[PDB]
Amino acid sequence: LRPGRIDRKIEFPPPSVAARAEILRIHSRKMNLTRGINLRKVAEKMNGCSG
Amino acid sequence: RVPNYEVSEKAFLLTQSKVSIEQRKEAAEFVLAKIKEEEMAPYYKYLCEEYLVNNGQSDLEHDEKSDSLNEWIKFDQELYNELCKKNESKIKELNEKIQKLEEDDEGELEQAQAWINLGEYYAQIGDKDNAEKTLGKSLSKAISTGAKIDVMLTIARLGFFYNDQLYVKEKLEAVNSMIEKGGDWERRNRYKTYYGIHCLAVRNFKEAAKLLVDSLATFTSIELTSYESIATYASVTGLFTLERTDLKSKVIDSPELLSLISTTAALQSISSLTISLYASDYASYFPYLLETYANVLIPCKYLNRHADFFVREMRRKVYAQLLESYKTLSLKSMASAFGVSVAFLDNDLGKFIPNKQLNCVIDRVNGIVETNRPDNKNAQYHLLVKQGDGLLTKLQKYGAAVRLT
Amino acid sequence: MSTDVAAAQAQSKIDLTKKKNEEINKKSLEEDDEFEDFPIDTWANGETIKSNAVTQTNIWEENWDDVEVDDDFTNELKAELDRYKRENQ
């Protein structure tokens, strides 16, 4: 963790509701849906904590 | 995006002499307004050419003559100001911005995407050639499979917009290979709805139908016509292709159709024609037919040209279904049920006998209609010799050319 | 109008001396000109310019609907003509 050893420390939070909708759409690009399914509402319902 | 399909529907009606004056000019206002607004002014040069001696034909780039009823063909200096104004601002901005994305140091994210950005502007204004060139550059360089299919759909749409089918035809055949490479069930669905439309333009309802049932459940509209429109299109294809029981499953008991109801003039009439075929109602079959010609086939941009083929087929279908069920009928009996006269019936029947769908002789002495059935093993025999004869032609002609070499 | 290299395009056909023979000899029956003689004389039909090419030489397959030129007006008139008698009985 000392400098001159490393050069970068990237931090990742878990998803936000906006971030969530994107992550969900990637998994959805590979399977079926039906009209009238809002990816937004499933982001709200999901409390999640992992992608 | 969304503006491109909706303008072209209305513009096609401007060409038609089959729609009422009222309707034609309801459309003509919508056209002119959204071309001036969104800068579809390069396409407007095409469209004057397309109206030209049907209705529209007084122009400041084509034929001078007073048999025009349309003023929405005619140029304006207001239109010419609009062209120039919008073109110069947007273009100027977008060329210098794009160039820098490709300039700076990154060729897999930024350079690929910038070419999409040129492509949106060409696709917006309806210049086909220069949209095909830019978007070629994106495809050529290496990117996601999903993006590769998606970009390619836009090019296909430009053909659909111009009302030129050979252009579409070239595009979706290429896309079709890339579908299993991405493994995307989402963009297989979006592929299906596109292919639906391509099959629809040319005469081939058989493939149209398989895809159109699929397009009711799933599609999210991406430069394609409403789901009201697609629902209507599914109904029409449904009657043509499928027998009584499959008509029942796929159309009538469709959760999709049931849940969209009848909210437009064209859907209202078509759903009525499906039910009456199924119910062995015959009185209301001929009235419903006249209404679907006016209000479904004509306002289409794909079944306005297949109108003649379609109306001839359903007429043949209804007569067929009654005969298939009945060994004997009277001309008077059959004619009461349909609501036409006896004389009017006899004509339409005797027209369709040599076309071998109806399979019935008709006596004039007693007025009985006997129903023969020579189709069976004998039927399959005529088909085989005929297709085999053709195959033989192919074998000799390809063969002889090569043997010479 | 050429695409790629000319190597692929020499590999997909080299013109035959046999074809040279066929073409000129046939031309004796074709008179002085009979390649463009008929569409020169008839002026390619005496009709409106329009914008479709699905009347003759359609892209889609030819199905017979040349029989009736419009059987939709006809079916309308037939239905309406019975309509009267029926109703007024």
UniProtKB/Swiss-Prot annotation, chain A:
Subcellular location: Cytoplasm; Nucleus
Positions of disulphide bridges: none
Domain of life: Eukaryota
Self-association and partners: May form a homodimer or a heterodimer with a related family member. Interacts with OLA1, TMA17, and UBR1.
Family classification: Belongs to the AAA ATPase family.
Function of the molecule: The 26S proteasome is involved in the ATP-dependent degradation of ubiquitinated proteins. The regulatory (or ATPase) complex confers ATP dependency and substrate specificity to the 26S complex.
Further remark: Present with 4700 molecules/cell in log phase SD medium.
Name the record gives this protein: 26S proteasome regulatory subunit 8 homolog
Residue range from the parent sequence: 305 to 355 of 405
From Swiss-Prot, chain B:
GO biological process, one term: proteasome-mediated ubiquitin-dependent protein catabolic process
TPR repeats: 112-145
Sites bearing Phosphoserine, chain numbering: 58
Primary location: nucleus
Superkingdom of origin organism: Eukaryota
Keywords from the UniProt entry: Nucleus, Phosphoprotein, Proteasome, TPR repeat
GO cellular component: nucleus; proteasome complex; proteasome regulatory particle; proteasome regulatory particle, lid subcomplex
Compartment(s) of residence: Nucleus
PCI domain: residues covered: 204-376
PROSITE patterns, alphabetized: PCI (PS50250), TPR (PS50005), TPR_REGION (PS50293)
InterPro entries (UniProt xref): PCI_dom (IPR000717), Rpn7/CSN1 (IPR019585), Rpn7_N (IPR045135), RPN7_PSMD6_C (IPR049549), TPR-like_helical_dom_sf (IPR011990), TPR_rpt (IPR019734), WH_DNA-bd_sf (IPR036390)
Single GO molecular function: structural molecule activity
Subunit structure: The 26S proteasome is composed of a core protease, known as the 20S proteasome, capped at one or both ends by the 19S regulatory complex (RC). The RC is composed of at least 18 different subunits in two subcomplexes, the base and the lid, which form the portions proximal and distal to the 20S proteolytic core, respectively. Component of the lid subcomplex of the 19S RC.
Misc remark: Present with 51900 molecules/cell in log phase SD medium.
Role played: Component of the 19S cap proteasome complex which acts as a regulatory subunit of the 26S proteasome, involved in the ATP-dependent degradation of ubiquitinated proteins.
Protein name in the entry: 26S proteasome regulatory subunit RPN7
Naturally occurring in which organism (per UniProt): Saccharomyces cerevisiae (strain ATCC 204508 / S288c)
Curated annotation (Swiss-Prot), chain C:
Keyword Metal-binding: no
SMART domains in the record: DSS1_SEM1
Pfam families for the chain: DSS1_SEM1 (PF05160)
Lineage top rank: taxon: Eukaryota
Keyword match Transport: no
GO term, biological process aspect, one: SAGA complex localization to transcription regulatory region
GO cellular component: cytosol; proteasome complex; proteasome regulatory particle, lid subcomplex; proteasome storage granule; transcription export complex 2
Coiled coil: none
Mutant phenotype after disruption: Impairs mRNA export and transcription elongation, and induces strong transcription-associated hyperrecombination phenotypes.
PTM annotation (N-acetylserine): residues: 2
Protein task: Versatile protein that might stabilize multiple protein complexes involved in diverse pathways. Subunit of the 26S proteasome which plays a role in ubiquitin-dependent proteolysis. Also associates with the TREX-2 complex that is required for transcription-coupled mRNA export, and the COP9 signalosome, which is involved in deneddylation.
Record's miscellaneous remark: Present with 5590 molecules/cell in log phase SD medium.
Family per record: Belongs to the DSS1/SEM1 family.
Subunit structure: Part of the 26S proteasome. Associates with the nuclear pore complex (NPC)-associated TREX-2 complex and the COP9 signalosome. Interacts with CSN12 and THP3.
Protein name in the entry: 26S proteasome complex subunit SEM1
Species assigned in the record: Saccharomyces cerevisiae (strain ATCC 204508 / S288c) (Baker's yeast)
Lineage, uppermost ranks: Eukaryota, Fungi, Dikarya, Ascomycota, Saccharomycotina
